[PDB]
Symmetry: D3
Subunit: 291 residues, 6 copies
Amino acid sequence: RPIIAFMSDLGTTDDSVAQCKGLMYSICPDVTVVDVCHSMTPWDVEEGARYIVDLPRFFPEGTVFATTTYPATGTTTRSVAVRIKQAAKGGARGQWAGSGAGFERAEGSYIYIAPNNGLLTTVLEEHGYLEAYEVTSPKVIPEQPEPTFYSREMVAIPSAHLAAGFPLSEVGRPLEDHEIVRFNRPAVEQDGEALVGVVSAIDHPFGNVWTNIHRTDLEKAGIGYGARLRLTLDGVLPFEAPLTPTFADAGEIGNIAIYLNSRGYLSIARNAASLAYPYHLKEGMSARVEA
Amino acid sequence: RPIIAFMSDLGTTDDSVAQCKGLMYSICPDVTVVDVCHSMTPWDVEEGARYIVDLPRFFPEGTVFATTTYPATGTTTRSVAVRIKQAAKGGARGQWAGSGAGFERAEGSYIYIAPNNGLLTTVLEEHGYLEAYEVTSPKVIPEQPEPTFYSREMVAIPSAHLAAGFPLSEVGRPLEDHEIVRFNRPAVEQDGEALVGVVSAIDHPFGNVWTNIHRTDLEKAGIGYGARLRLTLDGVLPFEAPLTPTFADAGEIGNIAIYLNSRGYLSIARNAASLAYPYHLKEGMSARVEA
Amino acid sequence: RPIIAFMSDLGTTDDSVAQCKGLMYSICPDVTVVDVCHSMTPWDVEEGARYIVDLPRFFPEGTVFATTTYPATGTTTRSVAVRIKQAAKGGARGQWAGSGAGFERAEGSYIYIAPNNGLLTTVLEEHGYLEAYEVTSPKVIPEQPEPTFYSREMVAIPSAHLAAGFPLSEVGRPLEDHEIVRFNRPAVEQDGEALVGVVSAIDHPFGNVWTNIHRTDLEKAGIGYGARLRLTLDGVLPFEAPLTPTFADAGEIGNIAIYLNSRGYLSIARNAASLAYPYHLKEGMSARVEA
Amino acid sequence: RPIIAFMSDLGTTDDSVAQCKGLMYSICPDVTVVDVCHSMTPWDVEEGARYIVDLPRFFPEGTVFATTTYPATGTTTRSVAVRIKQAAKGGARGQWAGSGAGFERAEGSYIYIAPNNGLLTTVLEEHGYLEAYEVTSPKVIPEQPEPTFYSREMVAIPSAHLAAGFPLSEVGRPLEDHEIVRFNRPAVEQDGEALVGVVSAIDHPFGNVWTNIHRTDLEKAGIGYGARLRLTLDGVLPFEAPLTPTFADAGEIGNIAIYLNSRGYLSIARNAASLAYPYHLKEGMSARVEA
Amino acid sequence: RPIIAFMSDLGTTDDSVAQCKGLMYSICPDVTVVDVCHSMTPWDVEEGARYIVDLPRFFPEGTVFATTTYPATGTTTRSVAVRIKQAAKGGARGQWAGSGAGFERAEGSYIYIAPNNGLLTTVLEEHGYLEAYEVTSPKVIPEQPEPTFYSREMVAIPSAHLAAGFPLSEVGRPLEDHEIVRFNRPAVEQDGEALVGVVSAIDHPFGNVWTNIHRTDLEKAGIGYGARLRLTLDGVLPFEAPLTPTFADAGEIGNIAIYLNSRGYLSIARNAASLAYPYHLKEGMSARVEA
Amino acid sequence: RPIIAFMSDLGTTDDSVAQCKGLMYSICPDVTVVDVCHSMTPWDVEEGARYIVDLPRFFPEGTVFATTTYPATGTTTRSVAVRIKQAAKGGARGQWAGSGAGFERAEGSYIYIAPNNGLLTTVLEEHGYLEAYEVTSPKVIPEQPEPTFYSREMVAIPSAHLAAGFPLSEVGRPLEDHEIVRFNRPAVEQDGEALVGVVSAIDHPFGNVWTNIHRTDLEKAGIGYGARLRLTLDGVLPFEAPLTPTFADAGEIGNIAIYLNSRGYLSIARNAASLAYPYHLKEGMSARVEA
Ligand SMILES: Nc1ncnc2c1ncn2[C@@H]1O[C@H](C(F)F)[C@@H](O)C1O
Ligand SMILES: Nc1ncnc2c1ncn2[C@@H]1O[C@H](C(F)F)[C@@H](O)C1O
Ligand SMILES: Nc1ncnc2c1ncn2[C@@H]1O[C@H](C(F)F)[C@@H](O)[C@@H]1O
Ligand SMILES: Nc1ncnc2c1ncn2[C@@H]1O[C@H](C(F)F)[C@@H](O)[C@@H]1O
Ligand SMILES: Nc1ncnc2c1ncn2[C@@H]1O[C@H](C(F)F)[C@@H](O)[C@H]1O
Ligand SMILES: Nc1ncnc2c1ncn2[C@@H]1O[C@H](C(F)F)[C@@H](O)[C@H]1O
């Protein structure tokens, strides 16, 4: 019962994703295709990375992740297919997902296939990898690929072959580590006592504000649950609240909650109301936190 | 071939729904996950209720409905799992769904699992229930649930256990009727000869106007197809048309149609044009109808 | 392993598509339902046609295409079910889809079911057909169809019967060619040396501009890759670039690319930036191209 | 103490109006320049006409009206200067303006100077004229007029000469009636018992709705104050109210008032709330009224 | 050389203000009409009050203030004309306006004429008055006033008679204090050490934030220039800055300044950047200040 | 009959301009105050400069220009008052303004008073100056200036004293040329045969596009009326048209006109339609022209 989990920038306003899916079912008739999301800002590899980095612990072992924004479509570039090492714990605390104590996942149990454009940067950082190959074999890609549709030709199609049991090491030559393109992750800075980062995302549809300041950055500064924080956004808008596990800890509906989100990052919200939308807060705004 | 039909407020702009789905396939490998919708206004339990109340007659017996907006995530609250009684006929006329005379559904054939926050109010009103339990067993929920993701921990995960055949009565203790939270449904008033209600929804993507005035309210006042109606919206827009089965009965494109929608409620539209969008008509505007 | 590929105007903001899907799984328990898209402009048959015409070569033989915008819902009209002839090659070059040399598809291998309102015009033009029937049998549609939901009653339901192996010729009487409604496709004009057409679509989410000027129209005028073109939009915005296979051929990010899209049509874009959105370019604007 | 009343399409976002005013004070040092308005939709002669037709009865005898939208700037066209005949009563009732019984104005007491492009159509209809001349003398216009600024060269400048006492008949040759350009005023139609016109303006900043249905059209159909009217806008939105003199006659704040505006035309509003803005009502929408 | 300073809700998008001005020049040929502003939110008497309360010290003695929003137009209501007592100092410090030590203004030197609807509430509070009359004489208003234009009939017209020297006490009968309508001014509360008020206005076009917390409220709590303040907006934005005289005192462009505005009220801004516009801050949001 | 022509960033949404005007009439009772405009983007000295540089030739000799955006309000900075040298010809051709051959203006006939922040940069470039003084005397400014209102205290007030005949050289000490702050005017570059500049302004309310490419730049490259030009905006929207004197020379309504505007600069428009608004063209976009 193979699964392909599919993340693209193709949208859901026409038949583009469906063309990919038709080919996936053609190649691997028993496959289940699970949509991750298709609404990422086109060509924003850092955003795409956020939608795929946390996936493995949630999925059955053997799942293939087909993950693509492909602005270099129709060039001599070729996709990378990697078998990751650690499925990796996650969340506010760092745990396995599932009922009971969670579902522990075996190492080496997931494949990602993507443009070699840095989309897999955080996947490789957080999970490591056991093997990586350039995707070139005409057994798994078209001999004559559609120039403007490499997300289909060089990701969707070969992902379905991999789901069907095509040997990963036969997709093409092995890639050395330096040949796998990475984007630079801007660091969270210490600035005296304060941590200085950025709003990584507006958390739709709630309008919560997610920062790139991780639990580990907070722990490094001695900030734990209960600490009274001043969190300043965009250089201008300050908020003040204690760090709490969840939204309802802020008390009344509309009150500010500062918390660790389900991906492990410092975040700010209103309790059962939107923070971001009324004040037009945006990704890329500065985020400074201090006790 | 178990089915989980999944309705949430998690959106389709990131991997949140996919994390839930991964766990569903982990727990119940043979499951089919059917998206109901994920775009409800967050925390609007009355809107969520509208998206789930009409579902049972359309689905195979044994379907599990995983339905969630979870503003009390991370608190001591626990979900409710209920086996409904009547699958219930529906539509403008009140019938079974499907070809021929429709698919008759057996009683006691569907389970809903939801936050205990009133989301199931109309489900319980229209279908009744045979049994209801608090969802507490660590066999079906995490021992250490993610504080900000109870839609996953307390709905998605246990729904998959239920779909896999976990006995409903083993999820936790039985709930008495008064322990199942309800929202108040404002009634349709008789006001002399007129029926007085509200616009329950703008029917996207068409911009039809749906009211909370049901067929049964119309029947009570003697109003049937062919009756010349005056339907006043927002206190000031007195539209006049006969009640007709469908949009084309209004004649020319753009003309006003007053009709019974597919959920059994009095509605108003233009024939193959949008009523609501040009005039910015809104949910919560008053709706008065009279012969 | 039957597949139904489902394209509607029902949106993804409520349970409407899910009601259709529940019935599809009820009728054909082994089916896979693949969403094409549900976000087309309601009642715009020409737009719907664009989302369904290219599908067959991507899907396994035996796939049923359930394709619907149904403004004549609740009238005496009945759907048409057709078995197409040629699956048809496609793309910028005209080829089979898939890995290697592509997946050759047998003739007569796909069924479309749709309102008989011209939605299938381009399907029939590009693929031909072997047989066409009016959908009337109460074995495949409701005896008492919901007046305002013919997309469910007269498309979704009978599509599932067809996917389950109900004989196509038993759905109702054969239709003569003249009884299958067509929309008029406005032609691309030659105007001296220039080709004169329209913007057929803004290609979301990228904001590329797609025209109705086909590869075959370009070939007729001797225009091939490398030709320096002047492409004028809306009568007044001229652009100049060579015809290239893909976006990156324009060089620097933001530069103009004029290319053949993956559906075989002359298009214009910026390289990894949006052309249409900053300048509010729109479907229906004139498009003139000349060497 | 001469007055120039100045209406243009030049806006108030730069120094354009001030350049005109500087020249007016240069030519006629004792002049008072009164702004009518400068925010008309550029080139919309019918809208400009509405802002100038009602002016004369309000101003001291001898006032010059400099009124201009000049899309034919820099062509061989020349402005028209006219001395009107009747100052003309106005309002809901048809009266002189001012305290007591009002200020009766002598005939032949006002000059309009405008592009000869139909801007003065309604001025001439409602007031008549005694004499009209083409504005060509280099004593009152530049010998070398700025091509793109005829509103200054051919209206503002010569208006100041006229205000200073330059003889009207010396500005250039007399114009015959047929040489004075007119726009066509679309008529109010009788359609059975109903009057069928258009929304002539959204009355900013209040969002009242003004129609082209005049008091005289209402009188012709026997409609007077107290008559219960059904007024339908845009073919779709009906309203019902009695015809009243003013807004407060509707009773509660927000209630619909149907009234005669201060220019003599049938209008619709909410009492101390905006009608047009919440429903996005627009100029050019149809307006049908019936008893 | 009489002056009428004219504040209305009539806008500057048509000839309405000009009709008023024409009549003013008709009645008082030597008058100078000074526009205060015409863009107030219609019917918002509290906003109108803010635009007129600070005026007297800036104008020559004998100036008439014609100030009007007239939602009760066409009713039996009549305007009030008042001679104020103290011209009153103003500003951040409380001083006369002008060069040197400023222009000292004599008592009893200004007349306001307005609808008797509370528009003059703050004028009377801050300046006091010596005499007040109902405006009823047909020597100064029309015998047959236009029902929908009392801002012209009952304010503009009689203001011009007053400017021309018509005796104030002859406009109609004297009004007792209780017959002059007032709106309620919500007070600034002391709440422990903090002062609790509201954002009175967004200061356009800069987007500074003006509160109803006056210098005198600050002085009462011992707060002077240099005091480190915490100013919380909307319950959740706790800005921190010293109280400074001006914007540049915040240092770098964009930094927060907390200051006393030119009307004497506690305000917050960014230095040469907009505070309110990026964050959509609004009038009516709470404003709490504390040392 | 003195004139003050007043340009500020104070807007027209409250009484701020009126406070300034009241003081101007207080100081100089016979003055005429002419509004230039009050809607400039706050603190944008380059934009303010565009609204004041062309004024002198239009106004009577002796006019005082009070021109202000004052972001350094409340600091030790003081305004500059300058007597300009040449009134300077202007327009597409370079001429005097007015009827006949125009009104020749004597040298040394206009005074500007402004913040010393570079607002007068282009005034001084295009007109030169005879004398410049720092504005410090308490005879012409307040002894205790309102910290946040220097546009009133240090521009409006002293302008009225200057209009009233206060000797310019007594306002304070003479300023050396290097003490008068200037902004840098980016040059128009020659780039092979092409001229490379920027869109200096969107010409509201028409949506014409004004560039910083002057007649003199065109003359330098041999470009005169009749030359076929390619004008490229924003790097990517090319237009092609001959250089013509005016809009109507483009022929049909909506056609592209490339012309010299009334300020002497290369511009592009549509004939009696908006160019900028439909395509959201903006100030600061690149503008390249070539024959
Ligand atoms: N204007 C553009 N420039 C660069 N890439 C584009 C593009 N429009 C779409 N794409 C890209 O083409 C990919 C396709 F191969 F699948 C999509 O995934 C893209 O991101
Ligand atoms: N793009 C355009 N096309 C035609 N006329 C225009 C224009 N832009 C401004 N105008 C016109 O030029 C006049 C001027 F002579 F005073 C203005 O009154 C205009 O309406
Ligand atoms: N700002 C907020 N306040 C309260 N609940 C929120 C929230 N943002 C998201 N949620 C809620 O978290 C749930 C999650 F547990 F699944 C979502 O279903 C909720 O709507
Ligand atoms: N829809 C409306 N309801 C109440 N008053 C209105 C109105 N529209 C305009 N006004 C009012 O009419 C006055 C006029 F007499 F001068 C204006 O000053 C008012 O605000
Ligand atoms: N206001 C309207 N007028 C005409 N058709 C409409 C409509 N609103 C929805 N529809 C149509 O009803 C169909 C249904 F039967 F499935 C949808 O597919 C529609 O296109
Ligand atoms: N937030 C702000 N920061 C800097 N200057 C400002 C400002 N708000 C208004 N101004 C400035 O204050 C001046 C005044 F003194 F007249 C106005 O002309 C301003 O440009």
